[PDB]
Design an enzyme around this catalytic site. Structure first.
Site, PDB file in Angstrom:
ATOM      1  N   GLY A 181     -50.054 -73.527  39.686  1.00  8.97           N
ATOM      2  CA  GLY A 181     -51.289 -74.255  39.911  1.00  8.97           C
ATOM      3  C   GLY A 181     -52.193 -74.109  38.698  1.00  8.97           C
ATOM      4  N   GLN A 217     -53.301 -83.721  35.465  1.00  5.67           N
ATOM      5  CA  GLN A 217     -52.186 -84.288  36.226  1.00  5.67           C
ATOM      6  C   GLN A 217     -52.624 -85.193  37.372  1.00  5.67           C
ATOM      7  OE1 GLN A 217     -52.591 -80.986  35.555  1.00  5.67           O
ATOM      8  NE2 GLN A 217     -50.612 -80.045  34.956  1.00  5.67           N
ATOM      9  N   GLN A 218     -53.868 -85.112  37.813  1.00  3.27           N
ATOM     10  CA  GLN A 218     -54.343 -86.037  38.842  1.00  3.27           C
ATOM     11  C   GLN A 218     -54.852 -87.363  38.292  1.00  3.27           C
ATOM     12  OE1 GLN A 218     -53.046 -85.612  41.519  1.00  3.27           O
ATOM     13  NE2 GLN A 218     -54.453 -84.691  42.968  1.00  3.27           N
ATOM     14  N   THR A 276     -55.565 -82.598  23.569  1.00  6.24           N
ATOM     15  CA  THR A 276     -54.376 -81.928  23.069  1.00  6.24           C
ATOM     16  C   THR A 276     -53.347 -82.979  22.656  1.00  6.24           C
ATOM     17  OG1 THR A 276     -53.433 -81.694  25.234  1.00  6.24           O
ATOM     18  CG2 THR A 276     -54.742 -79.856  24.413  1.00  6.24           C
ATOM     19  N   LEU A 277     -52.487 -82.607  21.695  1.00  2.04           N
ATOM     20  CA  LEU A 277     -51.644 -83.576  21.006  1.00  2.04           C
ATOM     21  C   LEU A 277     -50.209 -83.078  20.955  1.00  2.04           C
ATOM     22  CD1 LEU A 277     -54.028 -83.972  17.864  1.00  2.04           C
ATOM     23  CD2 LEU A 277     -53.984 -85.466  19.895  1.00  2.04           C
ATOM     24  N   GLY A 278     -49.831 -82.195  21.877  1.00  2.00           N
ATOM     25  CA  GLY A 278     -48.514 -81.609  21.876  1.00  2.00           C
ATOM     26  C   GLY A 278     -48.276 -80.865  20.583  1.00  2.00           C
ATOM     27  N   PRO A 279     -47.144 -81.158  19.928  1.00  2.00           N
ATOM     28  CA  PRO A 279     -46.825 -80.475  18.666  1.00  2.00           C
ATOM     29  C   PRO A 279     -47.786 -80.815  17.527  1.00  2.00           C
ATOM     30  CG  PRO A 279     -45.340 -82.298  18.960  1.00  2.00           C
ATOM     31  CD  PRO A 279     -46.132 -82.185  20.242  1.00  2.00           C
ATOM     32  N   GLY A 299     -50.892 -80.436  17.729  1.00  2.00           N
ATOM     33  CA  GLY A 299     -52.069 -79.590  17.876  1.00  2.00           C
ATOM     34  C   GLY A 299     -53.154 -80.121  18.797  1.00  2.00           C
ATOM     35  N   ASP A 345     -52.930 -75.666  30.437  1.00  2.00           N
ATOM     36  CA  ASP A 345     -53.785 -74.674  31.082  1.00  2.00           C
ATOM     37  C   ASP A 345     -54.032 -73.481  30.154  1.00  2.00           C
ATOM     38  OD1 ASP A 345     -53.696 -76.292  33.400  1.00  2.00           O
ATOM     39  OD2 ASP A 345     -51.963 -75.162  34.175  1.00  2.00           O
TER      40      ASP A 345
HETATM   41  N1  LIG Z   1     -47.049 -82.515  38.021  1.00  2.00           N
HETATM   42  C1  LIG Z   1     -48.040 -82.525  39.059  1.00  2.00           C
HETATM   43  O1  LIG Z   1     -48.233 -83.499  39.661  1.00  2.00           O
HETATM   44  C2  LIG Z   1     -48.888 -81.289  39.246  1.00  2.00           C
HETATM   45  C3  LIG Z   1     -48.546 -80.061  38.734  1.00  2.00           C
HETATM   46  N2  LIG Z   1     -49.500 -79.190  39.047  1.00  2.00           N
HETATM   47  C4  LIG Z   1     -49.586 -77.800  38.601  1.00  2.00           C
HETATM   48  O2  LIG Z   1     -49.849 -77.872  37.208  1.00  2.00           O
HETATM   49  C5  LIG Z   1     -49.456 -76.627  36.605  1.00  2.00           C
HETATM   50  C6  LIG Z   1     -49.215 -76.820  35.110  1.00  2.00           C
HETATM   51  O3  LIG Z   1     -50.396 -77.303  34.481  1.00  2.00           O
HETATM   52  C7  LIG Z   1     -48.244 -76.172  37.388  1.00  2.00           C
HETATM   53  O4  LIG Z   1     -48.368 -74.760  37.572  1.00  2.00           O
HETATM   54  C8  LIG Z   1     -48.331 -76.937  38.750  1.00  2.00           C
HETATM   55  O5  LIG Z   1     -48.448 -76.087  39.873  1.00  2.00           O
HETATM   56  C9  LIG Z   1     -50.503 -79.850  39.728  1.00  2.00           C
HETATM   57  N3  LIG Z   1     -51.683 -79.396  40.243  1.00  2.00           N
HETATM   58  C10 LIG Z   1     -52.487 -80.237  40.864  1.00  2.00           C
HETATM   59  N4  LIG Z   1     -52.183 -81.519  41.006  1.00  2.00           N
HETATM   60  C11 LIG Z   1     -51.038 -82.013  40.560  1.00  2.00           C
HETATM   61  N5  LIG Z   1     -50.730 -83.407  40.807  1.00  2.00           N
HETATM   62  C12 LIG Z   1     -50.141 -81.167  39.856  1.00  2.00           C
END
Ligand SMILES: NC(=O)c1cn([C@@H]2O[C@H](CO)[C@@H](O)[C@H]2O)c2ncnc(N)c12
Ligand SMILES: NC(=O)c1cn([C@@H]2O[C@H](CO)[C@@H](O)[C@H]2O)c2ncnc(N)c12
Ligand SMILES: NC(=O)c1cn([C@@H]2O[C@H](CO)[C@@H](O)[C@H]2O)c2ncnc(N)c12
Ligand SMILES: NC(=O)c1cn([C@@H]2O[C@H](CO)[C@@H](O)[C@H]2O)c2ncnc(N)c12
Ligand code: NA
Ligand code: NA
EC number: 2.7.1.20
Lengths: 311, 314
Positions: B39, B163-164, B214-217, B219, B248
């Site tokens: 999470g 991710q949301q 963020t830009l992956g590799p 930077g 994160d």
């Molecule tokens: N791919 C997804 O849809 C999600 C992945 N994680 C968490 O995002 C973390 C990585 O940033 C992982 O530890 C997951 O538990 C998420 N947490 C909240 N909402 C989401 N839709 C995701």
């Protein structure tokens, strides 16, 4: 007695309310269920009252699963319990169209190559049939060689492992089979990867069974005699996991009870649709009257009476 | 104190020794499967705690959270304000990563959806006003309500929807951004955010104090509303393994640096170090903090002065 070899697993089944890089699917259902192809077929054969032994490798966590299977009549004596590895895990997300995106982690399944069918034979007698289901690849080969060695009748059932096997390995799994089970896509892949023609394959087996999804199933004999059985139509499609296994179990249970090919395939089609209408592979229920009814509706009252007569 | 809101999860992480690029009925035979604490709020709280910051985890989990709770509390994380559901299990993330670090994943919210029942006023009353509230990927309504509450109670916050973003409408996104002390996304998410919101780059920067992309590799960019831009290249990896939680980790390291008084560039350099340490481990919270290794790789990438300055505040 039918000996079922193949995977034993925990299935982690999820539902995506959508239609199928960095892909993330927000799922609205997640359930854990007993699984593995051999688990599923042994369970169904036991529920329908057949004599069946489960032959595969699981982890130390298998005890509860063991009880579940033994309560349905499955002999689990010859399940190999690994000292270190956990039972295989299937992780699957199913979309609105019943399409699927899955991962499979073998775990203890890889130790199935250490099982000797000679022990099972010594312990329960020669089986009526050995189902060589999706398993550790070397286990599939060694099981098949042993059936040929000890003169045991076997069904080649390499469904989900076909993509993972080389052409030569596939060819080694087919020759001498009393049955070849695949779906139509797998049938085409098998022909391609082996280089065999349709005729080359039928020269080596006693019967080809090719499932066709919603178009039902074909039972094809080497002389070209073909029985086509349409599905028992679904009323509440939910998850396709385990539908092939259920079909095979129902069909082979019917054969073991002495039904003909067509009647056996009709019974298989019923068990298949019951699994389709359930989430887990072993979550379906056996209801004599519902079975008689839907068999009659699809296939006619005579066919249904004959089928339910042997159960 | 930093208040971290967002998902609390168990991550089920698998490795496919192939390439998804090469691939209705997809099955991947995987050769690793591990279960880990996860999470986004879990991950950022854990990292901030490991780096010595003051942090509270604010989100919803299930009754199984006890062990996770201990894990976090041993690293300094205040978990008092985790809401434990009476009925639902902790969210589950299921992910398969290929050779190229591409990923195919499923996310099951479970108890996460109850996060909308959390009131930041309780946390404020119990620990005071936070220095910053991280509005991480969460139950969507929780994200909105948490952001509205930060604005109401005058709390400084970081919009961190990552991710949301794909799951939210344009209007919901717009409601999450305005007034943010920070906007965190990756470059793809930044493009999606502009598209779905209809905002221009300038429209966004008029509403926030800083953009972190963020830009992956390549930077990370730190961009101020007047166009002042700091580009920080990565701490180069030596043993890429799983990208889960790299974002994160970067956010945690950067925000810990800011909380210790480092400037933008130095903070982003610390973030980049924590990011690569997570990239080089499978689980998101499986990395180790090694002062000397940290000083060394910071110096290798950014020079000895930058590294001494960073390790000084830790
Ligand atoms: N791919 C997804 O849809 C999600 C992945 N994680 C968490 O995002 C973390 C990585 O940033 C992982 O530890 C997951 O538990 C998420 N947490 C909240 N909402 C989401 N839709 C995701
Ligand atoms: N898709 C895959 O790769 C597999 C899925 N299963 C099981 O197949 C059953 C359905 O037939 C499920 O219960 C799973 O546990 C498998 N069993 C053995 N080998 C495999 N490669 C798979
Ligand atoms: N994919 C399938 O097998 C099916 C799709 N609709 C079906 N209806 C009845 N039986 C089935 N096996 C299927
Ligand atoms: N060295 C790095 O941080 C990275 C290398 N590939 C990466 N991809 C995504 N994020 C990252 N931080 C990296
Ligand atoms: Na099913
Ligand atoms: Na990682």
């Amino acid at each position: 007695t039918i000996a079922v070899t193949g995977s034993i697993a925990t299935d982690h089944l999820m539902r995506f309310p959508g239609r199928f890089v960095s892909l993330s699917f927000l799922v609205d259902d997640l359930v854990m269920h007993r699984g593995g192809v051999a688990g599923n077929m042994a369970f169904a054969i036991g529920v329908l009252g057949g004599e069946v032994a489960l032959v595969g490798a699981a982890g130390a966590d298998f005890a509860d699963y063991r009880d579940w299977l033994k309560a349905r009549g499955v002999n689990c004596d010859h399940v190999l319990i690994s000292e270190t590895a956990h039972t295989a895990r299937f992780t699957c997300t199913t979309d609105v169209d019943m399409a699927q995106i899955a991962s499979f982690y073998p775990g203890a399944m890889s130790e199935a190559r250490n099982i000797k069918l000679a022990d099972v034979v010594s312990a329960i007698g020669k089986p009526e049939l050995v189902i060589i289901g999706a398993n550790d690849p070397e286990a599939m080969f060694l099981h098949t060689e042993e059936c040929r060695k000890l003169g045991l009748a076997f069904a080649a059932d390499p469904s989900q492992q076909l993509a993972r096997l080389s052409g030569e390995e596939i060819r080694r799994l087919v020759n001498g089979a009393a049955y070849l089970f695949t779906n139509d896509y797998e049938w085409d892949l098998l022909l391609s990867k082996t280089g065999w023609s349709e005729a080359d394959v039928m020269a080596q087996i006693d019967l080809r069974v090719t499932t066709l999804g919603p178009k039902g199933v074909d039972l094809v004999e080497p002389d070209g005699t073909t029985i086509h059985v349409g599905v028992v139509p679904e009323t509440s499609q939910t998850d396709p996991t385990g539908v092939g296994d259920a079909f095979r179990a129902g069909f082979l249970t019917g054969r073991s009870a002495g039904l003909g090919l067509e009647r056996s395939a009709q019974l298989g089609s019923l068990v298949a649709v019951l699994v389709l209408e359930s989430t887990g592979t072993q979550e379906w229920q056996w209801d004599y009257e519902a079975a008689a009814s839907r068999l009659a509706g699809a296939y006619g009252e005579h066919a249904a009476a004959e089928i339910v007569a042997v159960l």
